[PDB]
Write a protein that binds this DNA or RNA. Sequence first.
DNA 1: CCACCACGCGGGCGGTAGCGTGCTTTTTTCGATCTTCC
DNA 2: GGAAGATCGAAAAAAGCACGCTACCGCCCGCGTGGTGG
RNA 3: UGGCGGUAGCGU
Lengths: 49, 101, 50, 48
Amino acid sequence: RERMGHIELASPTAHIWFLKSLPSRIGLLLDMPLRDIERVLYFESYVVI
Amino acid sequence: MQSWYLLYCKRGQLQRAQEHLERQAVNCLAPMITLEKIVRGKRTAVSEPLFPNYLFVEFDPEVIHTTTINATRGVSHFVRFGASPAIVPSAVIHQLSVYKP
Amino acid sequence: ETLRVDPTNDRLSALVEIYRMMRPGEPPTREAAESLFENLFFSEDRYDLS
Amino acid sequence: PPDLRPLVPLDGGRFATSDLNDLYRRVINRNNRLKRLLDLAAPDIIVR
DNA sequence: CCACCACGCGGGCGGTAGCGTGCTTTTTTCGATCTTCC
DNA sequence: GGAAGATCGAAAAAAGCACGCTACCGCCCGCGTGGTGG
RNA sequence: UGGCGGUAGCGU
């Protein structure tokens, strides 16, 4: 009842709780609108690093 | 004018979807891999579609619409990035055609 | 006033706008837009006032 | 933990799968498919 | 050699499209003015 | 005289909708693939 | 003897 498992994701995935819950923590931290974050997250537009 | 699109097909319906697309007079592409299989103890190679549930369809949206392709009785959906369906460059098509892994 | 506000000034533009509103995310073609408009209200199979 | 998402017997030879089990199965299947396609050198569009 | 009793993997469903459809309050965003200046 | 802050209303998205209790119904994954008996 | 969804009912 207490031992938990873990799954090693092939690629990193963003946390939905820290993304869609307004205000977006990731978007507020990165000084970019939520629309751009959603676009880059779901493979819609490249973002420069 | 004619362009390529990526299509996600239903499970176990790749051949039916391919035949339905061929009936619509569009170009269809799917990688084929020969892999040694058993099938009740006879030793040959079966054809398995590389990148399963993926089809590459060359057609013209003006000639026949996108939703018509989306509803060919066996096509699960379009591989769309954004509002509009994604466009695969011809270089990827050439790579897939020449590649025989 | 509604005519002034409306940007469309032709049947083709109106059909394209209607198709875009009805089915967003698809290439707006004249044949598809006219088929959708004629099948939405004036087709017995899809529209039927009892 | 499994007991947090138990499979209660249905006294008919079947089990009642919870929603969490279904979601975990979907995630595991997607991850395995992604790993297999990455190992196969899939094109960029398919990987994305 | 053919009918029928298991079986273990993907995903909206089904269809050569379209399906939704009688609440109110709070928070966020966005186009459009605007306006106010340096 | 154009650009940046204001703002302003209009639209879009998220969340809540009393407490206990009783009875009934329905359900608790499909389909191409495979082995076995008539 | 475990859950949900729907329906109906009781006390406010």
